[PDB]
């Protein structure tokens, strides 16, 4: 079953406008293989990822997830972004953490220009439990059962400097891939769209 | 201790004429701050020796 897992599949989509303040939170990523937000109107289908179908037939999941953020700039769109993973569970007030407070956590920066445009972010396995239950199968919150090993805010680390004959915004695809992935305790569950 | 802390950030414009002082920032005093990770090593200590890596 490692075929539909390691191949990067689009999980989310967010742009990056030039009219934003430095340090403004763009989009958080709840770090789990269960995450997807796309759909389609022709045909009427909720777009799953190929990793979200493998792990949804299990209780527990474990593995070093590799997020691949493919920006689509020109060569001259300049600036940098911040992909700051904050571990723990799916629910902490990470929106209240300031940008310089987010410099305490380990993270990475990426120049929008350059000769490449995709950053492979290998998420560490940071959890209190050695696995993580499919709490989406259940319908109740409980301290001890959770869904994610942490969240991942895309910050505005630098502004987007560009001329007027190019675009004012650069869109970022969120690929979903992994390495050393393990799941057990099988079940059947259809996942629902994380509506952010 | 060896992890980069964003101690300052600015925005340089066109209206700043030649040799205008855009930023006047202190190095170690902005490092000694509660919102960073080195506060857990500098609050319980008083006298220190260190080298500064600016990026």
């Amino acid at each position, epitope marked *: 079953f490692t075929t539909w897992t390691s191949i990067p599949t689009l999980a989310a989509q967010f742009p990056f406008n030039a009219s934003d303040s*430095v*340090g403004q939170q763009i989009k958080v990523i709840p770090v789990d293989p269960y995450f997807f937000q796309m759909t389609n109107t022709n045909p009427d289908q909720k777009c799953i990822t190929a990793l979200a179908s493998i792990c949804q037939m299990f209780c527990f999941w474990r593995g070093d997830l590799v997020f691949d953020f493919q920006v689509f700039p020109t060569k001259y769109h300049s600036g940098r972004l911040l992909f700051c993973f904050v571990p723990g569970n799916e629910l902490i007030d990470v*929106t209240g953490i300031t940008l*310089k407070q987010a410099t305490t956590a380990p993270c990475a920066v990426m120049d929008i220009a350059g000769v490449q445009s995709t950053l492979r972010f290998r998420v560490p396995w940071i959890s209190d439990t050695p696995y993580r239950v499919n709490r989406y199968t259940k319908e109740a919150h409980q301290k001890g059962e959770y869904t994610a090993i942490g969240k991942l805010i895309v910050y505005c680390y630098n502004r987007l400097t560009s001329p007027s004959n190019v675009a004012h915004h650069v869109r970022v695809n969120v690929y979903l891939s992994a390495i050393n992935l393990e799941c057990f305790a099988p079940l059947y569950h259809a996942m629902d769209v994380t509506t952010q | 201790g060896e992890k980069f802390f964003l101690i300052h950030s600015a*925005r340089w*414009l066109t209206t700043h004429a030649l040799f205008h002082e855009v930023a006047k920032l202190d190095v170690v005093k902005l490092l000694y701050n509660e919102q960073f990770a080195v506060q857990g090593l500098l609050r319980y200590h008083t006298y220190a020796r260190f080298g500064i890596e600016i990026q």
Partner: antibody
Amino acid sequence: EVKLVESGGGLVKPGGSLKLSCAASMYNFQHYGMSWVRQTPEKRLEWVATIQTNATYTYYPDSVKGRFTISRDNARNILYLQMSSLRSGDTAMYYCARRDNIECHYYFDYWGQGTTLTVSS
Amino acid sequence: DIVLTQSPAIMSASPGERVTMTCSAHQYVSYMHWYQQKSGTSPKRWIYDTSRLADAIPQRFSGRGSGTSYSLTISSMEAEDAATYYCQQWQSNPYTFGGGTKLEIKR
């Protein structure tokens, strides 16, 4: 475009209760902290309430701590500012704000059109 | 707790000259944020942390000063600034604003 439409306000006797509501538009709800800014016609301004994305954290000043209640909803994306024990100190224009993050401090980006609550009997 | 003090209360200036307003406090605040309350509408994105203008206003404005004094340097006055200004802190609990700076046009 941010369309923050307040709802509420009018003629409420002092000591009464009235709940406000500010709806979000075209942008994500689980990031941007929502607030309320009171606009008195003579002086100002006093800042009253904020509950964040997770509903655990509330931040009130010395004055309106415990008398006003701000709430958020992930389903409708509409605020709920429940007010009680009003008087002439709150007879003003009410705006709803949206608080995002900068390097050291925060900022309120986009504000609404504002509704009028007159508190007298 | 802490109270912000704006020294220009009511000012009127001809279009095409330099205007500087100042918001101070009784203690030391780090960064100061500004707004513009036009008639009939609400304040929008105007000024963030120290010299960080908005991304939709013209760039003929500036903001300097640290510690006590906080100058907002206007390079060239124009006919679009007939409104009321406020200054914002982000230190301790009440998050108070300034008393109000009404800048107008001299005729």
